[PDB]
Design a protein around this ligand. Structure first.
Ligand SMILES: CC(=O)N[C@@H]1[C@@H](O)[C@H](O)[C@@H](COP(=O)(O)O)O[C@@H]1O
Ligand SMILES: CC(=O)N[C@@H]1[C@@H](O)[C@H](O)[C@@H](COP(=O)(O)O)O[C@@H]1O
Ligand SMILES: N[C@@H](CO)[C@@H](O)[C@H](O)[C@H](O)COP(=O)(O)O
Ligand SMILES: N[C@@H](CO)[C@@H](O)[C@H](O)[C@H](O)COP(=O)(O)O
Lengths: 319, 331
């Protein structure tokens, strides 16, 4: 494919390699601040792909750092005019552009309530840098495609590095170091999502569990954004509590399979909706040696290239 | 009338809630003093399905009315990854009609083991959640026999509101709770809003709301999946523009959840935008009755529950027992 989306997606391994080297000192310093600060919770501020990145941070910081983590509801402030008690907590503002006024207004509120504030932004110069305490630059470069690809993976890579520095888990440190090579391997692997599966498919469900669910939300957003498919992401545990009735009528399901602690639970539910008659399409990791916490990113890196081709086959310009 | 268990159970909700608010006055008054002494750093909500969606209502409620960060637990953190969180000094509310899902129970045990003050809002008095937590607030909705929750969700919201009124002691919230049965009854008596003809030939749609209206939108979208087999997805009307709005390029049905609260201005402006872009709009509203803005979401929903029961019949689904569902689901 010759779209901006695919071209930008293919630069993600090398954009991240430069990011991990360039940010090593920044995130090394931040991890010690967090080890001293000992945040009571982490609140994520962002929209769209950045908000989905925050769902990844929830699983990351709760599993790896034991810190309760969640997403802000911007309307609480911008519509209802309320402040939250955020003293003793960490606020992470995620924004590729980093200049939208809604985003800046919530950063000011978070700082005014006593939170330690960090921003993950692609433009380090934007005025958000004057509000927050620490800026971690995404270093993804300009994103010209409508669909975020590299800027999302660079958000995850920054979150993983902050997590590796903060917790100091050496296993997680090696996974972050292996990220560029793992992503490059994903780019070179064979396609998984093929357009023939998605012909005449107006809506579908993306099923995942754990980190795989967090990446499902981003896959679901991309299916909407570049394929005009009404795709909705569910945890495979949550799907059984009502939504599974849609499998009684024809339903396509995109299965996000991650080889981590969640695998056992997740495959049990994939078998169930399969017996119930759903048309499964299986996404999985791209190489055998990939660390479980990094496997979600490689799956997405592969999906980004494959979904660009699916968009073209459906007559949509993903850009 | 649909003669379904779902509709019948939904119609008992004003009386069930009136009885609940009066029976729980003592326990909820005590909990409010506990919360004023405990001073929670945050509220974490544990639940699935309609109970998880009720927790989204609690987020807007406790954040707007008490300034306490509020959010949903990811049970897999505990039940699959086996981690305990640092929860000392935080409040954990387990919401469950049945009180038996194992991911829910494992997450309650880990919250209790982590030093959090734990509260359960549960309908089934016999459920094992009562043996893990510190305080139980009985929902007092009676047995719910339809698979689709109606009264038990409204009773969850009514308990969350009473807890808020007792904890904050805001006279607005106290008046809102005092007025709730009458608002629910008025909604039961109001004219139907959602009609089956609006949803025939709709395989998927978007529910749009903002604030508390977004919170009830998630429950509406689940009901449309659960009893109408429609792929309904709920979005905030702020969030919808960041990508999902692309679905308006083809024909797209949109269910508009309109709440006459602080969110009204932003929301109606965005409804007008997706209308101009070519979306097929369907409007739900709080009923004409003079409703407190914080009770308006519940009243809209009380109306929707009865009306959706008729949509289910018209689409050939038995809302009481949809083809692939149990009342007590275990994950
Ligand atoms: C749960 C989560 O990951 N994020 C949600 C997001 O999906 C939603 O769109 C937003 C609405 O914001 P609003 O209340 O400002 O409209 O609230 C939350 O942060
Ligand atoms: C309001 C909100 O964002 N709630 C989500 C819920 O939608 C999701 O289904 C669940 C998955 O739990 P799991 O990690 O056990 O699958 O986690 C979160 O609490
Ligand atoms: N372009 C979409 C993602 O592909 C959109 O959802 C995007 O993530 C969001 O609207 C912008 O967020 P930002 O502040 O990170 O740019
Ligand atoms: N029956 C459904 C709601 O109509 C289902 O999603 C339900 O809410 C879910 O299984 C959780 O049930 P609980 O409240 O008994 O925990």
């Amino acid at each position: 494919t010759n779209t901006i989306m695919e071209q930008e997606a293919r630069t993600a391994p090398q954009k991240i390699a430069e990011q991990l080297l360039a940010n090593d000192a920044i995130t090394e310093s931040l991890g010690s601040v967090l080890r001293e600060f000992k945040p009571k919770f982490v609140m994520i501020v962002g929209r769209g792909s950045s908000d989905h990145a925050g769902v990844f941070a929830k699983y990351l910081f709760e599993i790896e750092a034991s810190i309760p983590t969640f997403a802000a509801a911007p309307s609480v402030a911008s519509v209802y005019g309320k402040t939250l008690k955020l003293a003793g907590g960490l606020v992470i503002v995620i924004s590729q552009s980093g200049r939208s006024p809604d985003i800046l207004a919530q950063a000011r509120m978070a700082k005014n309530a006593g939170a330690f504030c960090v921003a993950l932004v692609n433009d380090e110069t934007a005025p958000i840098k004057d509000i927050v305490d620490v800026v971690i630059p995404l270093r993804a470069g300009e994103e010209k495609a409508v669909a975020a690809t590299k800027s999302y993976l660079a958000t995850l890579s920054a979150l993983l590095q902050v997590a590796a520095k903060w917790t100091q888990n050496e296993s997680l440190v090696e996974a972050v170091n292996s990220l560029p090579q793992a992503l490059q391997a994903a780019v070179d692997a064979e396609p998984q999502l093929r357009a023939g599966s998605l012909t005449d498919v107006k809506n579908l469900v993306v099923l995942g569990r754990g980190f795989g669910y967090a990446v499902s939300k981003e896959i679901a957003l991309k299916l909407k954004e570049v394929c005009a498919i009404h795709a909705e992401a569910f945890s495979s545990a949550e799907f059984l509590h009502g939504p599974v009735t849609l499998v009684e009528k024809k339903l396509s399901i995109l299965d996000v399979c991650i080889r981590d602690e969640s695998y056992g639970s997740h495959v049990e539910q994939i078998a169930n909706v399969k017996q119930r008659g759903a048309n499964l399409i299986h996404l999985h990791q791209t190489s055998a040696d990939i660390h479980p916490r990094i496997a979600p990113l490689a799956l997405l890196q592969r999906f980004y290239i494959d979904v660009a081709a699916v968009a073209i086959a459906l007559g949509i310009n993903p850009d």
